[PDB]
Amino acid sequence: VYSYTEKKRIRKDFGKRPQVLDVPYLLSIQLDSFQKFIEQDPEGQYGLEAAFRSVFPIQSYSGNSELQYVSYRLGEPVFDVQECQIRGVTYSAPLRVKLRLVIYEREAPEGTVKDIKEQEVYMGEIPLMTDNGTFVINGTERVIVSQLHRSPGVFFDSDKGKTHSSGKVLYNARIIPYRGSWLDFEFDPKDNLFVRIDRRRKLPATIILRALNYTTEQILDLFFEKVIFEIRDNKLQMELVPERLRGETASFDIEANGKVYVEKGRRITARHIRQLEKDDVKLIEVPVEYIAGKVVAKDYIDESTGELICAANMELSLDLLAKLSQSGHKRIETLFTNDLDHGPYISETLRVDPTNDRLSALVEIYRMMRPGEPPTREAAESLFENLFFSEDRYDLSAVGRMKFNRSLLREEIEGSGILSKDDIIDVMKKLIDIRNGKGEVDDIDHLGNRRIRSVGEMAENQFRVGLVRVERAVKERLSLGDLDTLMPQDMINAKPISAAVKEFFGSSQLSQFMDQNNPLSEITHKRRISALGPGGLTRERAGFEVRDVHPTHYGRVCPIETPEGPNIGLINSLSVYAQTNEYGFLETPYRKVTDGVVTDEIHYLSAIEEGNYVIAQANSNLDEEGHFVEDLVTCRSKGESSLFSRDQVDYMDVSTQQVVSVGASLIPFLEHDDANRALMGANMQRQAVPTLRADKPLVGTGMERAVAVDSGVTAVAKRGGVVQYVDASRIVIKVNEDEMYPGEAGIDIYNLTKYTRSNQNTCINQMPCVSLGEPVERGDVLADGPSTDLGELALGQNMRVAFMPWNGYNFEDSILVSERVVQEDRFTTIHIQELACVSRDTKLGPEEITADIPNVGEAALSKLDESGIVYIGAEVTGGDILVGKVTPKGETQLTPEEKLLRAIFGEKASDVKDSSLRVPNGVSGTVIDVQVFTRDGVEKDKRALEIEEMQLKQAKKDLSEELQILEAGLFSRIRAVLVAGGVEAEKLDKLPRDRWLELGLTDEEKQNQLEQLAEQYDELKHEFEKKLEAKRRKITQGDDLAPGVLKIVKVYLAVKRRIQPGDKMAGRHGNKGVISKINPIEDMPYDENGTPVDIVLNPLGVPSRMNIGQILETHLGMAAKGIGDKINAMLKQQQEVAKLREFIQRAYDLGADVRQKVDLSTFSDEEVMRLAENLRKGMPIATPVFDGAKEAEIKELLKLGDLPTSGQIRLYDGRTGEQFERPVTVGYMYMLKLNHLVDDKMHARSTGSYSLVTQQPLGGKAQFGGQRFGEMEVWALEAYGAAYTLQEMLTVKSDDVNGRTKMYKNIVDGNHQMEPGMPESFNVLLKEIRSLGINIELEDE
Amino acid sequence: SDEADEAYSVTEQLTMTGINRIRQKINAHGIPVYLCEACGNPIPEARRKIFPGVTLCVECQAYQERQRKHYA
Amino acid sequence: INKLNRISRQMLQEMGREPTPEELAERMLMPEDKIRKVLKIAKEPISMETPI
Ligand SMILES: [Zn+2]
């Protein structure tokens, strides 16, 4: 059940699993986040409404001067997108707010209002989001990478080991809020427990308990369990709770009933506790020595005196037992301490507690928060209440409360805003229990502690900071507040908020240039998480902790796609099915499980909600109904993974792909690659430059179509219909009768984007693929972009590789590319460089853009027209002129004998200095397009007038073609008027269309309908008169250029770089390479049938770097081209549709269980010929990533062709014509072309420009300056005895500004001497030391 | 050499040293002990027969392992 | 300079989008070119050790 578009070539699809969650729209992060940002949102939640409800209303100094909020608006831009890339504006959208300045009357708190002046005030231009989540800030398409930062809540950290040298670990616990004072708990190595408010001094941690209305009795009964001792007529009985005695010294005879069930000295093993439980002991009679070290909880005083016998939390010695014996107590309370489990911590910290009771504790808090402030009753009350208990001065965000209740094993995920007695006490219990053995510590990386921002929330915060810095000014201008003379816009300033928001979108560690050199690059750049930036941890502070992968990445961030090198792991790329949760933490799909069934309901899980479940594994064969095939299946429960019984799973992975990203899920046979290698593979697939004829992955992974379509490059049909008029520019879809709106149907039209620059200087082209008179279904591609083909992402080209050494040309990783790959121009990649030539305004005068140039005859000026700009199309080369420009330079200041010379030949020395924009030395191109911006203070020249006329012709053509469709829709609606009630069918197609307004009709509601539709027609008329007026006026106006520039002339060269020894190349699995000798055809190897193997890689790179996936891909490719050549023979020897059907059907079934059966008996006889003609280059093959095609499937798919099952053909060398012993592997591997081109990298500099502060080399153009002869190189030269080369390496070649010119004079005059002198850098050092008062001089002898 | 080759060497180093630590722990050589090195209880047959020459009863082992779980 | 800044804040919301020298040359009654030169001159110099 396929469409008519999908049948262009139906990708053979292995992969055994059924997909149950189709791939989400890959750009959900950017789009949905910026959608939450900018929208009138009738609820106080996120969006701009959040910021405005936060900072407004502004009340003055209580003076009945208020400025409140009403509602805002997003006026449409003045320049739309492509206009805004041409000209250079920020694709903004002017903001508007309805602020409402109210002024209450004095002698009135809320008495009668005296003025409510309601006026709408401008502020800022928020740069809107394109349809592809890519803003346009200054002409270039920029992208704001999602950030990943610590969620405000609670954290229990270790800081294990190194401190204190005893090895003993500390267990600190931090309560970070959204906004307010922190709170920390920590152990000392002496094991007492201490607190600290915001990172200030430590404190005896019981002081905060006491400050919260806790005296020692209830402290000890919160942080401890009770053991009562009894004095029942003889010597110190004890309560026996049976499980109190696991792992403890038996320092006494544990008898019972006068029977000995446990004996002294031993240890109470589980046997003993078992037997005491079975033998029912409850009150054991132990000696006094065992109470001698116990601790007494409650307070005891002589009941006859009221004098304090034992304070709370004192150790009972024998004397105190005696003393309270004579007071009439048979109950005694003792803390159940223990070295293992119920440790003494709060008790011994009370030992450390200097203070005694509540008021003293509040005093100490007041003296630790701020010194010098004398303590006080109410000062202490206010300070302590306002640390953690002030709704104004402290608020966990609701995210804060949610983490704080999920990390305590609480109940409600949402609740209060400030802390409480119970929140603090639960923190402390959790802390002590962490240290007691039960419980564990949340390591940093755990994605339950990495809330994900994105464009929306970050821009919201920047607008927030803007609002605070402006409400300062608002309250200030309200200080002087005249009641009714300042409207609600002189209080504000617009440029503040615009400054903040532009600073974010244009200067950030996030808002960065789109890696727009390959559709996979954009859609793997917009899906991106970053841990750097403002508010995240940067490298120095942190640090190795967050580089790591952590088992909560399984389906939430890709593990095998992260930028290797300087910052690994800080650029985690988001998974395939991942999402941002409601609160923010990354979440992912999982299929629900009933009693024992695998439901098809996908259910989302965040990070903190997972471990309490037990998730199955997607690689589980299930039994045609939703029951597993076994009773025990692999699963993963809490980090660990293991076998579980069938009746225990709760969640199955949505699909085998979800562990990866869109980066590494395109690598076919990813499953057989060492993870570093898939890392480098994805990170070299993000850089493939779009070739000239982008072919297709001959072996793909299923996700490639979704990446091509969901990225913006393909030209996706908005509505299904017939194709009326294709063309290299535009595609005209005639919408069908059912997908067609009721009024003014019309037809959809797509203006493609022909040749044009992207940021990385490549060609972002679009070519139609659906030809004239041809159906298209909704949601289908019309026009392939760069590196797409038929809507299947084709980054590089497939080609014939043969693994074999072949004379050292591929030594380390080098590659040997036969000239059949470069003759065809199949890696010939097109690069569209932009050269600008401004025309500035110096003190001497304005630069000219004349065609009149000195010291260059007609020679270099043959390509220039009458005005100094080159023609569109002249094939400039290295060193020619594109824009003739001359600057007036007075004071020629003639010299000696040069003056004699001018006398000798009378040649008038000109007043003008040539500065024309000449092509960079080396490129060789075609000037595809010249644009001339002009300050509107200059008379536009002749060529700019040509350009204005031409663009205006174009825009007139376009907008008139638009008006035609529109009026056709309105005539349609007119017929829809007549069709009901008195339509005259054939009396309306004969006569002219324009004379339908005067068509007869009875004066019912339908005559008034005709009148109304005539009104609509004339409105459209005047509308497009005035709209073409506005188009002509946008074109005709001057530009608004930088300060002091007359006119800029942009010239778009279009180089075509082919391929040449040095151009890096690479497969997908991470086999790099540097194509190293572009061999003839004859020389290459050739299999017994004749075909020369185009590339020749190296065998020594498959075992050493375990990326055997490239050998399996090579074999699947060889089988694929086997099928291809079989269809080619069946089609060239032209057979029929019948043989083709039987053979393609044999290819598409092919054995093992698959989810792809197509049944070509429904393809019409003429579709299968088209299907063949698209397969005649070779049958594509899918292979979902961790669910690929196992080897034996490949072997049978080879045997379906006629290749040898071994995969290894016997090759004959091309030069000697004699068989390679030991057959080689040959196949069709898909190889990219990385854009580390050679001619971008090559560089050489003999005498260029120079610096200005130190006479060193400095060039610009391609760092047109010498290589850095750094320090380690100087160590090298000193290691050799060579010292002359060093002396000239930093005296003659580099700095000594007489040494270098004398060296050049000597070199030209054929005397290789050198006259060093002394470096100008050291002379600067003498001056910089001497400006300080340090007289450094050089002795002279 | 490449940047993944060096990472392979480091991964070999890391897992080899970890595994060889944990094989250094387990004894596999008899020194028949017959009752604890701390508590004195008899070590049962099954435990002394799995791990030959193990000085400590089961409970003493769990207890020392738990005091060491907080890393000394 | 301070006149241009006051009138530029005021024009930035009076006209809505942002001002042009042709228009400051008629709000301010200056000769339409002193505005250009003033706007070229009135800016600070970049700290030459700025980090790129
Ligand atoms: Zn023991």
CSV table of C-alpha atoms in Angstrom, one decimal, chain A residues 8 202 231 396 526 571 586-587 673 705 865 959 985 1044 1046 1054 1126 1180 1188 1204:
chain,number,residue,atom,x,y,z
A,8,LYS,CA,10.4,5.8,-7.6
A,202,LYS,CA,30.5,26.1,59.0
A,231,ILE,CA,15.3,-1.8,86.7
A,396,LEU,CA,12.3,27.0,44.9
A,526,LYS,CA,19.6,22.1,15.8
A,571,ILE,CA,28.2,18.7,23.3
A,586,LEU,CA,14.8,14.8,28.9
A,587,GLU,CA,12.3,12.1,28.4
A,673,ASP,CA,31.9,-0.8,15.3
A,705,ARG,CA,14.6,9.8,4.2
A,865,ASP,CA,31.9,47.1,-18.2
A,959,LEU,CA,3.6,39.7,-8.4
A,985,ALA,CA,-23.7,26.6,-17.2
A,1044,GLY,CA,30.7,56.4,6.5
A,1046,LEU,CA,29.2,55.2,0.1
A,1054,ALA,CA,31.4,30.5,-8.1
A,1126,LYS,CA,21.4,-8.1,-13.2
A,1180,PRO,CA,19.4,0.2,-2.6
A,1188,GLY,CA,20.6,-4.9,10.7
A,1204,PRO,CA,31.0,-15.2,-5.3
